[PDB]
From a paper:
Here, we show that the Ty1 retrotransposon [name] forms virus-like capsids in vivo and transfers between cells. [name] is enriched at the [name] neuromuscular junction (NMJ) and transported across synapses, and disrupting its expression promotes both synapse development and structural synaptic plasticity. Because [name] behaves in a viral-like manner, we used cryogenic-electron microscopy (cryo-EM) to determine the high-resolution structure of the [name] capsid and found that it is distinct from the related dArc1 capsid, with a larger internal capacity and the presence of pores similar to those used by retroviruses to carry out their reverse transcriptase activity. The capsid layer is composed of the Copiagag protein’s CA region, which contains 2 alpha-helical domains.
To enhance the resolution of the capsid region, we used local reconstruction methods to determine the structures of individual subregions of capsid known as capsomers, which are sub-assemblies that are found at the vertices or faces of the icosahedron. Because the [name] capsid adopts T = 9 geometry, there are 2 different hexameric capsomers along the faces (a hexamer with local 3-fold symmetry and a non-symmetric hexamer) and local refinement of each hexamer provided high-resolution maps (overall resolution of the non-symmetric and 3-fold symmetric hexamers are ~3.5-Å and 3.4-Å overall resolution, respectively). The high-quality maps of the locally refined capsomers allowed us to build an atomic model of the Copiagag protein with high confidence and good stereochemistry. The NTDs form central spokes at the center of each capsomer sub-assembly, while the CTD is arranged in the capsomer periphery. (D) CopiaGag non-symmetric hexamer is colored by electrostatic potential. The positively charged (blue) pore is at the center of the hexamer. In place of the spikes, the [name] capsid contains positively charged pores at the center of each hexameric or pentameric sub-assembly, similar to HIV. The positively charged pores of HIV function as gates for dNTP entry into the capsid for fueling reverse transcriptase activity. We hypothesize that the pores in the [name] capsid play a similar role.
Author numbering:
A (entry chain B), B (entry chain D), C (entry chain C), D (entry chain F), E (entry chain A), F (entry chain E): 3 to 186
Write the structure that this text describes.
Amino acid sequence: AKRNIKPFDGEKYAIWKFRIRALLAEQDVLKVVDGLMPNEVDDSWKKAERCAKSTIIEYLSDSFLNFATSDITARQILENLDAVYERKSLASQLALRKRLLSLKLSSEMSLLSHFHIFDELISELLAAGAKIEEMDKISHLLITLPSCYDGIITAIETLSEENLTLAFVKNRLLDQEIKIKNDH
Amino acid sequence: AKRNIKPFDGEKYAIWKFRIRALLAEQDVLKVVDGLMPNEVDDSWKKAERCAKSTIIEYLSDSFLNFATSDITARQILENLDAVYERKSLASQLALRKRLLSLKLSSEMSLLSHFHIFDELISELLAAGAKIEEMDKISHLLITLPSCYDGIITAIETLSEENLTLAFVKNRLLDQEIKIKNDH
Amino acid sequence: AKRNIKPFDGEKYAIWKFRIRALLAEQDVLKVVDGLMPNEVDDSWKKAERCAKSTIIEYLSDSFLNFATSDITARQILENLDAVYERKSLASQLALRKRLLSLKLSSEMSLLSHFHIFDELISELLAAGAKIEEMDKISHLLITLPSCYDGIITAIETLSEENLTLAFVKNRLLDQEIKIKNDH
Amino acid sequence: AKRNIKPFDGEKYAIWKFRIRALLAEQDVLKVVDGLMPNEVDDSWKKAERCAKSTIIEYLSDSFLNFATSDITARQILENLDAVYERKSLASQLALRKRLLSLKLSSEMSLLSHFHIFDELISELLAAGAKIEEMDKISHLLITLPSCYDGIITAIETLSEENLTLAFVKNRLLDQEIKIKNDH
Amino acid sequence: AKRNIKPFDGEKYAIWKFRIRALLAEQDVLKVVDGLMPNEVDDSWKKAERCAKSTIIEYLSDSFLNFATSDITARQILENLDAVYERKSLASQLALRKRLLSLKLSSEMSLLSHFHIFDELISELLAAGAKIEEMDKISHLLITLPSCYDGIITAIETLSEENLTLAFVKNRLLDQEIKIKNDH
Amino acid sequence: AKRNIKPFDGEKYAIWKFRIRALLAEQDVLKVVDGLMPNEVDDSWKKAERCAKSTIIEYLSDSFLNFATSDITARQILENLDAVYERKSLASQLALRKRLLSLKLSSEMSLLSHFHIFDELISELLAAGAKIEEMDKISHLLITLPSCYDGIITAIETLSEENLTLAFVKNRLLDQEIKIKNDH
């Protein structure tokens, strides 16, 4: 159905997995991957499993068929791909946190690309066994900015830590980005 | 279904949203986005929800999938996108007003491209939350023109401000642009 | 359906309009644009309106959607496009007559491309609002040719008016250039 | 359906008409073009007429849409195109005969390509209604050959004028061409 | 259906004929061309003949459409193309046999291009009415490779013969080439 | 249906066979290949056989059409292709082992890509009839790493050979890669 999914070439596994899961959810098949295996399986379950396996095999590049050649269901294929490409290791978290704690904003880059990079790093941390909530994301985003945003950083941190959301902080930062680009 | 929609890469959100809304209306699915949530859900409503969510996910770039990563409906995805990209802000509208006031037609550019740029700026300013009347758009268009159009700028302002539509002014400006190009 | 209709980008509006109308007629949707609005609208009429609007939006560039941005029917979109791009402006007619009269053939040119250029100029001129019959088209085409064609030009202008058509004249000119190219 | 059909740009009209007729016959729609118009029209006839007209418009270049701008059926479009193009002017027949009378075999061209070109010329001339006997075709083919085939020319002329066929002459010419290429 | 069939332009007629016959067998139409004229004014027979003619015409280039312009059955069209491009002539067969016997192999081209040339020569002999079996093909192939392949040529020729194919020999020769390239 | 299948040209036969089998299963046609032939054949079985043969032929290159020239079914084509290109021979697997020995890790390549290449080679070797135990896979993986992994290799070797799996070794090597890339 959806043909905007680039075949898995070993790069950007999160995006491919998300698009495959969305496409499966379109066809009322995502219950196979997530839902528990019923004690008795009927024709509908078999058809759903066949459709999920066919879709996953179709959206895998030629070199990656070996993840599906064996007699393994779609959920097993996704589990194997997740284990190979999204592994929960403390070393990965420790390596990624140092990059996240040293991610300054370059002058030539706008806050939209910087926000995209920061969100990519946060999602990569969350892929491993990390527990980062909204407040930690806000704190990292605030500490990953140059000195021109000191006023908004001081003002935002004074706000109560119960209604703060990442979108609100991002909008407040973009407003001062617009203000700052005028004063430089 | 319709592959003329450019994936949303953070630029020209109004066009992308309009195209997505039109595509959803074609499939008889737009009732998810705008129609009220029924008290009792059925198979048709769930199918429409899934189809709308899958279409929106299909027509988003790889960077913007975090708007749909959460288990939320297509209506909520569009609401979040509206709040993050079509929010009403005063600083942004002030910057757009400055850009409109500092907009000058270049010699190389033709009046059609200048009109397109002016309409884009007006649409962005209106989305930013600045109410603009037709006469304000007409005055901006008149003052954003070079000295070659001074005669027609003076002539147009003398007309009564009761049926002066932007289309008539644009047509007259094109007609005199033909004469201006004839004399160069 | 058909992808042979190039998206509208401000050039060759008549061809795009005709192809869009033909595509709408193929899907039995042209009654929306041409047929009178019924007093009571049913599911079929609104479905046809949605299909026409989606088709026109799909075959419009991202810069030309400002007309359709307002929630208005496709018939009004076509009417606005016609008013903007097919307007009875005398200055455009005069400029296109001046360009058409001074349209001498170049040495490095193919007469099929010359016919294409002449026909697009004529189509633009008719869009400008100046009616040109057949005889004027043949006269302009004949006067646009060099002196090497004088024999066939005189033979054609000596022929009867009833048998004189633009396509027949173009065929005669092709037959003559075959000899001209052979005789070199 | 068939994408092998080249859009009609004013050249080789017979090929385009044959391809379009075959495509229409594929969809069981050619009955509209060829069959008599029924006194009472139904939904099927209207759908077939719409499909035929839409296909003809789709497989027409931008320079020939004027043949379908008027509100006419596909039958009338094909009739007008036949009237304009399915007629051989005196100059066309004279040019065909001149090409036949001045046809020669080049060094780089093989005998298969030359035979194909000669057969194409004969087919085009017969399309104009010029009856040609087999001996005339044989004489034309023999005089269009170089001087390297004089031996087989002398051999062929000595055969009785009762069993001379074009196929036998072509086979003998190819057999001699094999030796001629060997004798170099 | 099958679009891998390239349009016939007087090149590699055997491949095109095989693909066309396979496509006709897909639609159960081969009875029209291979049957002993079981004509009994059947509607199914007429439909099959029309479908065969349409399929043959679709996969023919514009140059070669003169082979099917007349009202001849698909069997007659295939027979005419066979008589034109598969001519049983002993002189051509002898010349091609000389070409095979004096083939050898170059110093720069890989085994794949040499195999393609050998396949072209063998197919042209089979077109020329020469009866060649698998063993004859292997014997012709194995006398053209350089002395670097003698170690595998002797081993292949020493085998028990019986059930060995040209494809297996080609695979072994490609493996030997892979082993050779590491040294030379 | 799916045109993503590269036509077979003697390279990567397993991928081509898997894609062809998947496509046949999609069309409800694969039952002719795996399922037993019924004693009495009906029209449905004949249609499925025709579809399978035509689909296999369509995705065979012009060089490999000789595998289906004779009157054979899809099963015969697939079994002949298996016998020629999927046979379990010493020569088939010795080359694969010699390629595994020379799979040195490059500096620009991450261990994810190198692990994928090693897995592809191991799967190809398994398809070559050479059964490989887990420890052999681990040793083959370990001998392809540079001197930067000496410590982890020694630690792995000192481990007991009871529950040492390839996944555990790969995870340890990836953690060591993180540590190494940190130390540069």
